[PDB]
């Protein structure tokens, strides 16, 4: 039943992403405007090379594309996860450097702003996304007579300890891709929220309407990410760990039945990122609307 649902869901997030982040990239061509642009590139690159896996899931084992694309597309989808999480966290730390300590922290924002953070986060993304194409090949399994895309973990290690290799890789990616960046983002936005609550006086006549918009946007900014990138790594490591200690049959089956959906939930944030970071400040609203209405006719 999900065999057509998963591809349709992938297509729905593709249409959404290549629209939202496309418009963001068009309108952005202020500090924290490099990070918006970098975030927009990750969303467009992240969802554009999906229709290949969209078509592939339709048969669940038939991969009607080159062996090479099982390397390029997987490398793109991994480098983009890491770049998008790393950039979004760098964006929150820049906000912290600029809003909590605006006087004593001028030098650090001069050094580790979008000038160096962009290059270093992209370098770390590419450097951590190596084992996704080094170890990934293609094989036509005689048990299905269908050319499937899969990983070997044999091109580097011995098969005698393959369980430890997969455990280590699975634990390491979540630790470097969701644990540290999410903690950093949570700390930065906790301190920015303390500052916003401290500076904007509540005992004012229609002056606190600047205190609920900002606090709400901070809470949404943390919760969207905490509720998108969490179930994926949750189920992933839950399955990779429980299947190794001691597990039943109604647990593992549910995990395998729900993973092709937890891997579709982590693709909606990629589409939400514009409507939370870029089209939230009314500056892009006016410029983007003027640009979208200039050359486009008044009659559909």
């Amino acid at each position: 039943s999900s065999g057509a649902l998963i591809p349709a869901i992938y297509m729905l997030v593709f249409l959404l992403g290549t629209t939202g982040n496309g418009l963001v990239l068009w309108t952005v061509f202020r500090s924290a405007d490099i990070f918006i642009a970098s975030l927009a590139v990750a969303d467009l690159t992240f969802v554009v090379t999906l229709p290949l896996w969209a078509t592939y899931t339709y048969r669940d084992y038939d991969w009607p594309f080159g062996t090479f694309f099982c390397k390029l597309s997987s490398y793109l989808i991994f480098v983009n996860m890491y770049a998008s999480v790393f950039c979004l966290t760098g964006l929150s730390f820049d906000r912290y450097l600029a809003i909590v300590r605006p006087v004593a922290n001028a030098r650090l924002r001069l050094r580790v702003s979008g000038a160096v953070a962009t290059a270093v986060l992209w370098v770390l993304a590419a450097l951590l996304a190596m084992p996704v194409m080094v170890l990934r090949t293609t094989g036509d399994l005689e048990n299905t007579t269908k050319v499937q895309c899969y990983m070997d973990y044999s091109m580097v290690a011995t098969v005698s300890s393959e369980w430890a290799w997969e455990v280590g890789l699975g634990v390491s990616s979540t630790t470097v891709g969701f644990v540290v960046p999410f903690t950093i983002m949570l700390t930065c936005y906790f301190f920015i929220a303390q500052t916003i609550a401290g500076h904007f006086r509540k005992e004012r006549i229609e002056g606190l309407r600047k205190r609920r918009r900002l606090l709400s946007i901070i809470v949404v900014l943390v919760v969207t990410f905490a509720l998108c990138w969490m179930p994926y790594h949750l189920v992933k490591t839950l399955y990779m760990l429980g299947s190794l200690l001691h597990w039943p049959c109604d647990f593992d089956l549910f995990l395998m039945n729900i993973f092709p959906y937890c891997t579709c939930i982590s693709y909606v944030n990629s589409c939400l990122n514009p409507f939370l970071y870029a089209f939230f400040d009314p500056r892009f609203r006016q410029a983007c609307t003027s640009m979208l209405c200039c050359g486009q006719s008044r009659c559909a």
Partner: peptide, 13 residues
């Protein structure tokens, strides 16, 4: 059933 979870999605780990 203990299949690899990397041959169904676009993310191996």
């Amino acid at each position: 059933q203990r299949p690899r979870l990397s041959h169904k999605g676009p993310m191996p780990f």
